[PDB]
Every structure is written in C-alpha cells, then in structure tokens.
C-alpha cells in the first residue's frame, strides 16, 4: 500500500464539503407547499397479446406509438389510441430485457442474455421489418440501451461497463468504466450531453458523452439500484433500490435531497419515472401495484392497483397525458 | 370508421392470429436448463444427445421436441437473471464423481446444488442429477480413500458403497422434500442411454403437470 492510505483521506475530504453546503433541507423549504391532493387514475386501455411476461416498454416521441418486449421472442408496436397492432417483429433470441424506440421513429433496438444489441429498420421499401445491424463486444448481458440519434446509441452491460456505439460501422467510440458491480439502468439528459447509470454496488455515476470521463459519484443506498430517471429540468435525478426506497439527488448540490419510504412497504422498486412538470414521481413495485409520490413533500398521493403480478416497466408520454405500465401477467395498461 | 381505418383493423386482426399459432407451437416443446460446475461433464452430455451469452440445442426423441439451454459462459450476478428461467420443465445438474480429491471442488458443487435446488423460483421443478466420470473415478478411490473428501465417512473404500454415499449426500440437501423429485443417474462417457433416462424422467413431469391442468 504505497498510496492506498491517501484515497481514504481524499474521500473523507469531500465528505465535509458536501456537508457544508447543507444549511437547509428540501422539507424545511417546501413545508408550506400546497398539498398535491388525492390523485385518482383510471385504466383507459388494455393491450392484450404477448403471451409471456413483459420485460421492457418504451414510448414513441409522437406520444401515440409504443413498443413492448416479451420473453416469447416478439416485439410488438401498438397504436395506443385505437389498440391496433402495427408491427410484430420476431426475435432471433427469446431472452430479451431491453427495448428503445428512436427519437425519429425509424428504428427500434433490442437486447438481452445474448450480449448483442440488434437494430431494426421500420421504413423499408419491401413491407417488412429488417435487421439493420448487430453490435457485439459486451461480455455480459445487456440491461439497457438508449438512442442518442439515428446513428448513436448508449448501452449498459452486466460486465460493469457502458459503451457508445457508431451504428453505420458497428464499433464502440467510448467505453465508460469505474463501476464495480453490474450496470442495471441508464438515463439520458434532456439535452443528451451526459447520462447517469446505476449499478449493483449501490452507487450512481454521471458521465459526459464527449470526453468519456466520470464527473460525480453518488452514494447512500443500501443495495442494488434497479431504476434511474432524470428530472425534467436536468439538474436532479431519482433512483430506485431493492431496499424499498427512492432517493432524489442534486447535480449542483452534489448530495442528497429527499427519501421516499413507508414503513408498510418492503419489496424492491422495479421502475421509476417523473411526470411532465416534475411534481409527481411514479414508482413500480413487486407488491403488484404502483405508488405515486408528491415529489416536493414525500407523501403518497395515490395508488395504481390493477396488475396481477410484478410491475416491470413504467413510462410516461412526452406531453404527460398518459402513463403506461407493463407487468409479468402479460398485460399493458394505460392510465388517465 | 373509414375504409383506411377499417383496413388497419383487418391487418391488426390478421397478425394476432399468427401470434396464436406460434404460441401453440411453443407450448408443445419441452425446455431444459443445463447447470453444473467448472468442467464437470456438461461438455459431454450434449454429445450423448443427438444435438456469446447462452447456447441453445435442439433434438427430437420419440416425436418429442427438446430445447436445452447452457448458461456456463456467463459470469454475471445470478440473482439478476435466474428468474428468467422459472417455468422451465426440468433442470439438469452435472457433477463429476472424480472431483473429490481435486482442488474442494466437490464442496463447491454441493454448495451450488444446494443454492439452486432451494431457490424461490424453482420450487416445483424437478432436478435430474448426472454423476459423470464413474469410470475414471474407480482408478482413484482404490489408491485414495474417501476420507480426504468426506471426513465423517463411516464405510468401506469400495465402489459399491462410496458411489451410494455421494448420491445420498446430494439428494439430502433438498428441503422441500415433497414437491420436487430428484432423479439421479450414474453416467460413464460411453453410456449410450442417457437420453432415454431423460425421456422417462420428463414423462413423469408431463403426467404430473397434466394432473394439475385438470385440477385433479
């Protein structure tokens, strides 16, 4: 140990700095905030299909089309206003855990226990959906993937790394590192100039896409961080762990703001998302249901109890008009 | 509705009829999960059968389709993806009998067997246990008593008994004694009949699952 004795003192040096920026608290400021009322959402649509458990779901940019992935080896694109099915894409491997819909609407991505990200083309002059590219190089299972534009995508793998790819060639441009535990989730900033990731060592890191460096590390959870999502302004994010608790972090205060826990909740959190204004926080649980939290006061505002098994996916449209939740009973529901 | 919207509905109905055909075809195949230790003999049973993250194998025996999955090449937290395989028909566990002296390795296998057999997800799946290398195992025990591996072994240093003492120390790790049976076979590299044993080990599982689909 030539210098391992000074890393501990360096870590102790940044503790007292994130603790001299804590004059007040979020509660001490939002104490007299108006209550959010009693949120009541009702199921408007139910999408039937996908015989097996549903693992991933993502909304399109036009807030009308969404894609879902299931373990029967199918990708289905739905028209949510009319419950119609637009496409059904058969997968080469049936062990899938991730789907993304591009911002332009021309491609979708997939991945799972085959350590490969597959990209499909939805606008072809032949009537079908074709594989456009397969990206290989991760040595563990693929857990999340998020499009940047038509020609870039960020993936996180169980081999404790994240990568940035070029699709027209099929090679990595940057490789992010530092986690010592499998990465399980990704979230892109609204300007897509940086992103946060959460791993199984109960830590979250922020990285910027250009330089490929790590900026800040956030600690405070007790077990694996399974979901992550960024506030709409882009200066905060929320995490969901297996210790039955969500936390809110500030990128400018560089510390913790608020924790959302109840004494009658014991199961882990599978998904997390914000509403359009950032006032509500949607969280999915193994309790078979989904809580909503007043983000500014950390009080439950309502429940979403309509599923017969574990809630695995959860997302909100870009105009904040509907919430879609997937589950292990092979059903998709749209609320309010 | 307009003609163009009525034609979208017709297309949607056309493609969900194909989703039913594929679902019925996949509910007839039986799927198996191949687990084991490091170089325990998992790379040999597949060649007994007719036959990069995971590898899938396909073979047919007496008008029955089989699908075997291998997850050996995956060093990722098992608790994060092992739930993907719940609902599998059965599990194949390979244990090399000659790993007693080696290094320890047999203890690592007893720990791995104990952990997968007593899982939360696998609470009603049956386990088919293969004890490979029963031939090379003979050349060692006569010059190496089992006490170097099992200290409290109260018995002789002979094949007839040392082979039945590991089978009982593996089948005793079960805790839900009743909902799960364990079928243990003694394989020998040129055994020529493992696939038959798997066949009439999964026939009983099919029968038991038929007694549930009728609620009997």
């Amino acid at each position, epitope marked *: 140990d030539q210098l391992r004795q000074e890393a501990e003192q360096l870590k102790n040096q940044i503790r007292d700095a994130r603790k001299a920026c804590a004059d007040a608290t979020l509660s001490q400021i939002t104490n007299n905030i108006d209550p959010v009322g009693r949120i009541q959402m009702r199921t408007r649509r139910t999408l039937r299909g996908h015989l097996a458990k549903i693992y991933a779901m993502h909304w399109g940019t036009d807030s*009308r*089309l969404l894609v879902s992935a299931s373990q029967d080896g199918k990708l289905i694109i739905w*028209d949510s206003y*009319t419950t*119609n099915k*637009v*496409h059904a894409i058969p997968l080469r491997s049936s062990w899938v855990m991730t789907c993304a819909y591009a911002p332009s609407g021309n491609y979708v991505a997939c991945g799972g226990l085959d350590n490969i990200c597959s990209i499909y083309n939805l606008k072809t*002059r*032949e*009537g*079908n959906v074709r594989v456009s590219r397969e990206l290989a190089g991760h040595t563990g299972y693929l857990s999340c993937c998020r499009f940047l534009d038509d020609n870039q995508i960020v993936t996180s793998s169980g081999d404790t790394t994240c990568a940035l790819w070029d699709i027209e060639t099929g090679q990595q441009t940057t490789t992010f590192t530092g986690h010592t535990g499998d990465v399980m989730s990704l979230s892109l900033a609204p300007d897509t100039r940086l992103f946060v990731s959460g791993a199984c060592d109960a830590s979250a890191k922020l990285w910027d896409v250009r330089e490929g460096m790590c900026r800040q590390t956030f600690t405070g959870h007790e077990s694996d961080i399974n979901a992550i999502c960024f506030f709409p302004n882009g200066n905060a994010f929320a995490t969901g762990s297996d210790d039955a608790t969500c936390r809110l972090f500030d990128l400018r205060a560089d510390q913790e703001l608020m924790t959302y826990s109840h004494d009658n909740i014991i199961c882990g959190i599978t998904s997390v998302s914000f509403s359009k204004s950032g006032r509500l926080l949607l969280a999915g649980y193994d309790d078979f249901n989904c809580n909503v939290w007043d983000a500014l006061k950390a009080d439950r505002a309502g429940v979403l109890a309509g599923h017969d098994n574990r809630v695995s996916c959860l997302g909100v449209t870009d105009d904040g008009m509907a919430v879609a939740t997937g589950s292990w009973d092979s059903f998709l529901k749209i609320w309010n | 509705l*307009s*003609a*163009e*919207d009525k*034609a*979208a509905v*017709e*297309r949607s109905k*056309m493609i969900d009829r194909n989703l039913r055909e594929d679902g019925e075809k996949a509910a007839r195949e039986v799927k198996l999960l191949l687990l084991g230790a490091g170089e325990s003999g998992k790379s040999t049973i597949v060649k007994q059968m007719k036959i990069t993250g995971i590898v899938e194998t396909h073979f047919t025996f007496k008008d029955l389709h089989f699908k075997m999955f291998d997850v050996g090449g995956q060093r990722s937290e098992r608790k994060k993806w092992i739930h993907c395989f719940e609902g599998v028909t059965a599990i194949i566990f390979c244990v090399a009998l000659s790993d007693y002296d080696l290094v320890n390795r047999m203890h690592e296998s007893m720990k791995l067997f104990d952990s997968i057999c007593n899982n939360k997800w696998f609470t009603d799946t049956s386990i088919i246990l293969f004890l490979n290398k029963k031939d090379l195992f003979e050349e060692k025990i006569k010059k190496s008593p089992l006490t170097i591996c099992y200290p409290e072994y109260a018995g002789s240093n002979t094949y007839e008994e040392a082979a039945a003492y590991i089978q009982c120390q593996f089948e005793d790790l079960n805790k839900r004694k009743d909902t799960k049976e364990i079928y243990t076979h003694f394989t020998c590299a040129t055994d020529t009949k493992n696939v038959q044993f798997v066949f009439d080990a999964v026939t009983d599982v099919i029968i038991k699952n038929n007694l549930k689909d009728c609620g009997l």
Partner: single-chain antibody
Amino acid sequence: VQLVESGGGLVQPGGSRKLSCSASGFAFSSFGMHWVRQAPEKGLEWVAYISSGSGTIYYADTVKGRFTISRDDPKNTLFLQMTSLRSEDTAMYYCVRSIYYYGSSPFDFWGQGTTLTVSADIVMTQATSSVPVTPGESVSISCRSSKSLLHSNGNTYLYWFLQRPGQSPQLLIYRMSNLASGVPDRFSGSGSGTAFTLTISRLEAEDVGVYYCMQHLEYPLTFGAGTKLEL
C-alpha cells in the same frame, strides 16, 4: 420492387380474357392490390380491390358480375377474370399495391400497364384542363369535391398523382399534407374541407404531365378529370 402485367390483346365483344400481374422484390402477401384502368385519351378509373388476406373484395358498379379478382400468394401473382366484354372496356389496365397501417402511404407503386382492345358517389371537380407554363415560375393546381373529405379522426383523404408523358402514374402527396418518399421538396399541398390546392415552386423540365386528385374516403374510389401542364 417490380410489377409486370400481361394478358391483354384484341378481343371480340362477348368474349373473355384473363390478366396477370406478377410481383418481384417485396413482401407480396402483406399488400392489398387494386386494378385501375385508363381509357384511350381520357382519364383514370378504379376497377376492383382485393384484401391482403384475400378476405375483402370490392368492385366498381360498372364491372360487377362480369369481373372477378383473385390472388395467389405462394406464386406471387394477381389475376382478373373478365367475361362478356363490352366495347367500352377497351383501356390500359394497371396493377397497384397499397398497405394500410398508422402512418403508411398507400397507392405508392404502380405497375407498367397492359393494353386491351375489344371489337351517392363523390365527385371530384377538377380545375381548368390546361395551364400554359414556362420554367422557373410557380403554379397552383386546384381540386374541388362534392363532399367534405375531413373525417372525425382528423385525417383528410386526398391524394395527388402525376403521370408523365409515356409512363405510369406516380404518387406525390398522400392525405393532402404529406410528401411521398422520393419526390423533391418543391411540391406541397394545402386546403381543407371541399377545396384543395397543390402548389409547386420553381418547376423544372420534369413536371410536365397531367395531375389527378383522388379521394380515399369511401368504398368506390373516384378520380379527378386531370389537368395538363404544357411548356
């Protein structure tokens, strides 16, 4: 993508004939197919339609009974059986493919055409049949319907086609405000209700031809008269 048709020829009145149209280069089984004919020196006229799954068929009132449409998906071929041929069925028949889902563009690829010589419904009032024009200047083309094509789901079902001299029609604008993939950006479409307009800017020596407006609101598809653009 390719469509080749054959079967036409000289015929005596009261006879019979069979036309074929063989696809090549696209997923033929996923497309609905139409037959559209054009009289000698007159305009376009829809004939029949067959469903993707062959579970829906429509006919024009003028060929009902005599004509019957069918498809053979394993061989990728489309047929049209015609009997008791009158002297007013001599035309050039076309093979058109169309696919229907949220965001598609129907009527996008037309066949090459096979000639045949023998021996309540919305009307679409076309503008003046002839507009003189020079390169550079921008012109406008006006169609007018006898019924509002704006449905309650928000879509307006109007289509624009261009037929160059000596070729088959090609799609320009679908659902009145969309640009078909492959055409330049100088074409645009406006209007709403019963009056529509197509405006082209800085025309080159490639927009000469006749322009057709078509409605896809109801069952029997109808076309405009067509307006020529001469240089």
